[PDB]
UniProtKB/Swiss-Prot annotation:
Keywords of this entry: ATP-binding, Luminescence, Magnesium, Metal-binding, Monooxygenase, Nucleotide-binding, Oxidoreductase, Peroxisome, Photoprotein
Annotated localization: Peroxisome
Protein name as it appears in the record: Luciferin 4-monooxygenase
Pfam families from the UniProt entry: AMP-binding (PF00501), AMP-binding_C (PF13193)
Assigned GO CC terms: peroxisome
Coiled-coil residue spans: none
GO annotation, biological process: bioluminescence
CDD domains found in the cross-reference section: Firefly_Luc
Single GO MF annotation: CoA-ligase activity
Matches recorded under InterPro entries: AMP-bd_C, AMP-bd_C_sf, AMP-binding_CS, AMP-dep_synth/lig_dom
């Protein structure tokens, strides 16, 4: 039907080659132009050129190949944003070794979980993540080799990427004669991203599709010379990962920050003549509060982007206003879709439109029937960036992605007559009660760890506000105490009249499930 929204034709058609071959080709070209900046560390002010980057990545690929890694192996890159981050990443993509970026503020257990899924043979780690990695290594025997990222010399008995390279490169190695590995880009996994979190396996193909979006004048950035991006987002997460890979294809200057600071951020936008800035959603709310913005020459700034993270119309508008932009670039994407598949086209709080290569439909929550215009239903997407599946979790894979290839997002959305998508009150006796407001009240009680509010169905009152509560460990609390507590804080219409159902986990809040549990226990 016309109830499947489909992305238009891309400006740059999907190119043949693995993601590693496409990156090598692009990077080798910029490398041949002396002084072309690939990355700039805003904190230390150091620039690293494409020639430096290309040559180091090529040497790492060859050294890892010589060492013995192939498509049967995975590496983990565990580091805060740095000039060094993408070296092992590029190196591994060039030879078809899967890269599993591990969150650098993960404690040792989150780190252990992550790595337990990715089962890396070699781990690249920044100096400050070494202890954690040594402790994870104790437990994961597959980790044979630890390599220090931000060191030139060996560091604490471990080789740096430079000494490792020197250990395995053949004599007379020539970075410009190196030819990347060619392999099936559909079967060969580029990135294993973290979404108990799961490993999302992403074949080279999804990166190659992303490379088309990255330079799309509508769905990405037009490749203009001297384009600079200020990136504050984590490189180990899909937003930072896939925008950066795309920027490297485009020859852009990626200015990185690993620690947010207001002045450094705005001074960087100005001094580096940044055209495009990337922020996590909570930095958007932050900038809605900033009064320093006008002190800076941000004449080059054209875009502030949220990636696959949707923002409220209000926060987005507040931030566009503060930066005197007509809007904000947002979108919707999941770890499981590589990057955003609904993006604000160039030219409300519409999350954007379907990206080239993709199709999106919303289905009835009950029946799964594909719904039409401005009808709310579950957002499902189908396209070449959808993951291959969860690493060693086919069940979870099958529950998310159907037999026709549609990924069931679990999110509710609808599309207007222009194909703009939008991502999306309990009524007690006519009176409106926003569950979020009762949840905030419940969350702020010392005995309550987590709470989800939904309307227990009660035809006489229409809907009774009820809650599922996860208690704080060691803390005991009765339904009465919780209902009383709420009543003491809210107007009569907002009282928790439907009660509490104590759960261990609150199903974004799956309101339908919260509702389900309420009906099972209550009636």
């Amino acid at each position: 039907a016309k109830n499947i929204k489909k992305g238009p034709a891309p400006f740059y058609p999907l190119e043949d080659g693995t993601a590693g071959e496409q990156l090598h080709k692009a990077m080798k070209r910029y490398a041949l132009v002396p002084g072309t900046i690939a990355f700039t560390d805003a904190h230390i002010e150091v620039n690293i050129t494409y020639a430096e980057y290309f040559e180091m990545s090529v040497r790492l690929a060859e050294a890892m190949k010589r060492y013995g890694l192939n498509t049967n192996h995975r590496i983990v890159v565990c580091s805060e944003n740095s000039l060094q981050f993408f070296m092992p990443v590029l190196g591994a993509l060039f030879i078809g070794v899967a890269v599993a970026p591990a969150n650098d503020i993960y404690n040792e257990r989150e780190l252990l979980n992550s790595m337990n899924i990715s089962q890396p043979t070699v781990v690249f780690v920044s100096k400050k993540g070494l202890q954690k990695i040594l402790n994870v290594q104790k437990k994961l025997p597959i980790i044979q080799k630890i390599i220090i990222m931000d060191s030139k010399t060996d560091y604490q008995g471990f080789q740096s990427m430079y000494t490792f390279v020197t250990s395995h490169l053949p004599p007379g190695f020539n970075e410009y004669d190196f030819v990347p590995e060619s392999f099936d880009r559909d079967k060969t996994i580029a990135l294993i991203m973290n979404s108990l979190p799961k490993g999302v396996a992403l074949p080279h193909r999804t990166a190659c599709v992303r490379f088309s979006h990255a330079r799309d004048p509508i769905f990405g950035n037009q490749i203009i010379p001297d384009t600079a991006i200020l990136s504050v987002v984590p490189f180990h997460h899909g937003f930072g990962m896939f925008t950066t890979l795309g920027y490297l294809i485009c020859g852009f200057r990626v200015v990185l920050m690993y620690r947010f600071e207001e002045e450094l951020f705005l001074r960087s936008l100005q001094d580096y003549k940044i055209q495009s800035a990337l922020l996590v959603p909570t930095l958007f709310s932050f900038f809605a509060k900033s009064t320093l913005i006008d002190k800076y020459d941000l004449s080059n700034l054209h875009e502030i982007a949220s990636g696959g993270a949707p923002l409220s119309k209000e926060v987005g508008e507040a931030v566009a206003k503060r930066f005197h932009l007509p809007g904000i670039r947002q979108g919707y994407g999941l770890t499981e879709t590589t990057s955003a598949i609904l993006i604000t086209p160039e030219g409300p709080g519409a999350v954007g439109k379907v990206v080239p290569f993709f199709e999106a439909k919303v289905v009835d929550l009950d029946t799964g029937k594909t719904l039409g215009v401005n009808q709310r239903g579950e957002l499902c997407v189908r396209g070449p960036m959808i993951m291959s599946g969860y690493v060693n979790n086919p069940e979870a894979t099958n529950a998310l992605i159907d037999k026709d290839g549609w990924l069931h997002s679990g999110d509710i959305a609808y599309w207007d007559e222009d194909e703009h998508f939008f991502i999306v009150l309990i009524k007690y006796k006519g009176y409106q009660v926003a569950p979020a407001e009762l949840e905030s009240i419940l969350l702020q009680h010392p005995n309550i760890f987590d709470a989800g509010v939904a309307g227990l169905p009660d035809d006489d009152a229409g809907e009774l506000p009820a809650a599922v509560v996860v208690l704080e460990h060691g803390k005991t609390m009765t339904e009465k105490e919780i209902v009383d507590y709420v009543a003491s804080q809210v107007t009569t219409a907002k009282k928790l009249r439907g009660g509490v159902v104590f759960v261990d986990e609150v199903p974004k809040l799956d309101a339908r499930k919260i509702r389900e549990i309420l009906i099972k226990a209550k009636k």
